[PDB]
Amino acid sequence: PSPNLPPGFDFTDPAIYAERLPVAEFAELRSAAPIWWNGQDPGKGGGFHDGGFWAITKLNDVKEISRHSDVFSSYENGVIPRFKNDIAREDIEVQRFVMLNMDAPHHTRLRKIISRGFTPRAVGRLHDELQERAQKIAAEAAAAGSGDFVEQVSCELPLQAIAGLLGVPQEDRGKLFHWSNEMTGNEDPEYAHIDPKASSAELIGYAMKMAEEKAKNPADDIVTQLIQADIDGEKLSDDEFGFFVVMLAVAGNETTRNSITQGMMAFAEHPDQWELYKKVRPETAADEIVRWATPVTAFQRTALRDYELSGVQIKKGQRVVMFYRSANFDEEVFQDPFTFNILRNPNPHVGFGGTGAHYCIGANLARMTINLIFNAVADHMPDLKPISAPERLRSGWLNGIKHWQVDYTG
């Protein structure tokens, strides 16, 4: 029997996410049609005019698609499944210059060079400066009594993580944070005037300046390890470094910020978990927060050939959209998936995507960022309470919270 969904229901519809997460509709597919053709009417495909896509709602299918990168292509259509309906195909294809939208061997070369800047050591060297800044951010917010938890608690730390990682001088971080914020959310009315293409161009030019300058004066940031040829002469070109900063500026901003916001929303709704967190401060909460928040609701792939996924015949050229929001609540993998449990161990969520070639390289930078900020929130505003309901981001693939007015005192 066909799933009980409204006719023409598009799981990438930004109008849905502007108001809520379609949790019931996802649970419907998981039970009635775990792989389901999401038909899209002409001119309503978010920039893709192929008739629709396969909705992937089971965690095991999500992991299988991520492992079989040989078949399921990130390059053919990019991984973002929704833009403005009228986006030019060329603006979709320009994203193929960043590592995330690439296939092997091009992606294999970039990922190896980029791995020099995401070592455990490099990330861990930021721990003390980020812990200090997390405490300062929580105290500054708690002194204000009440305000916007999104802007006053969640925004700054993930952005300072990028600046610290990249070695951006303090006087340039406002420049960088603006460019990063100018690239996501252009389908929301609050951000209708941002220009991601223009912001990407200025960020590339600024990143090439940094690349040229840091060859002359090598430092101990990741940049030096990136633009430096190894014994094989392998390194990022100046423009390749530009496209990485563009990817990093976007990747390391809203996803962590929404983890933090939706993490505190879960704590506000599960006071038993909040009291437990303030007492034990378990770092496993970071993963449960990411599982709950699922900041990236979905990324997509295009099949390079016919493939049988869980009895469903995927035909060459069709898109598959991996709904991490649904897979992260798969009843087959998680015990009581709708219970917020900051002790969940092990926690094989696909919030950072399915294991494979494209697994999130900043996952532990994100986990550290989340853990430091919530320790600060517990340190300085342990009795905070929301004063109103959060405003959601109108986006077809990003689970965003624009604003959340909170009283940090009580």
Ligand X SMILES: O=S(=O)(Nc1ccc(Cc2ccncc2)cc1)c1ccccc1
Interface contacts to ligand HEM, rule CB under 6 A: 66, 74, 79, 99-100, 111, 162, 247-248, 251-252, 255-256, 259, 290, 295-296, 299, 351-353, 358, 360-362, 365-366
- C-alpha count within 13 angstroms, C-beta hemisphere, residue 45: 21
Among candidate residues 306, 349, 302, the one with its CA nearest the CA of residue 321: 302
Q: Do the beta carbons of residue 211 and residue 241 sit within 8 Å?
A: yes
- What string marks each residue from 357 to 386 as x (binds ligand X by CB under 6 A) or -? ---x--------------------------
Rule CB under 6 A: say whether 350 interacts with ligand X.
no
Pairing type for strands 312-314 and 35-39 reads: unpaired
Angle between helices 238-251 and 173-181 (to 10 degrees): 70
- Secondary structure, 3-state, 119-148: CHHHHHCCHHHHHHHHHHHHHHHHHCCEEE
Residue 309 interacts with which of Cl ion, ligand HEM, ligand X, none, CB < 5 to 8 Å by class: none
3-state secondary structure of 307: strand
CB of 102 to ligand X, least distance (A): 10
User: Beta-carbon neighbour count of residue 14 at 10 Å?
Assistant: 20
**Closer CB to ligand X, 179 or 274, in the complex:** 179
Q: Pick the closer one to ligand X by CB: 34 or 45.
A: 45
Q: Give the H or E element holding residue 216.
A: helix 196-216
* Residue nearer to Cl ion on the CB measure, 94 or 276: 94
| Size of the residue set binding ligand X (CB under 6 A) | 15
Nearer to ligand HEM, 28 or 307 (CB): 307
**Contact (Cβ atoms closer than 8 angstroms) between residue 363 and residue 158:** no
- Dist CA 346 CA 344 (whole Å): 6
Q: Does 200 bind Cl ion (CB under 5 A)?
A: yes
Annotated binding-site residue? 155: no
Rule CB under 5 A: choose which of 4, 8, 15, 198 binds Cl ion: 15
Which residue's Cβ lies closest to Cl ion?
Answer: 15
Of 336, 374, 367, 297, residue with least CA distance to 12: 297
Task: Spell out, one character per residue from 26 to 65, where the chain touches ligand X: x when CB under 6 A holds, - when not.
Answer: ----------------------------------------
Close Cβ partners of 356 (under 8 Å, ≥ 6 residues apart)? 63, 66, 67, 68, 69
15: partner contacted, choices ligand HEM, Cl ion, ligand X, none (Cβ within 5-8 A by kind):
Cl ion
Among 98, 130, 161, 322, binds ligand X (CB under 6 A): 98
Q: Considering only the stretches 192-200, 255-263, 334-342, 400-408, report the one whose residues sit in contact with Cl ion under the rule CB under 5 A.
A: 192-200
Size of the site for Cl ion (CB under 5 A): 2
Structural contact between residues 377 and 142, judged by C-beta atoms closer than 8 angstroms: no
Per-residue CA distances from 312 to 10, 164, 172, 249, 315 (Å):
19, 46, 50, 37, 9
Q: Which residues contact 395 (CB under 8 A, 6 or more apart)?
A: 14, 17, 18, 82, 184, 185, 187, 188, 297
Q: Which is nearer to ligand X, 28 or 103 (CB)?
A: 103
362 labeled part of a ligand binding site? no
Using the rule CB under 5 A, give the single segment among 193-201, 213-221, 297-305, 332-340 that binds Cl ion.
Answer: 193-201
- Comparison of 86 and 336: residue with beta carbon closer to ligand X: 86
Q: Work out whether 289 is an interface residue with ligand X (CB under 6 A).
A: no
Its sign, for the CA torsion 97, 213, 362, 104, is positive
Binding residues for substrate: 185
- Residues near ligand X, by CB under 6 A: 80, 95, 98, 100-101, 183, 196, 200, 246-247, 250-251, 255, 296, 360
Q: Residues annotated in the binding site, as ranges?
A: 185, 360
Binding residues for heme: 360
Report the interface residues with Cl ion, using CB under 5 A.
15, 200
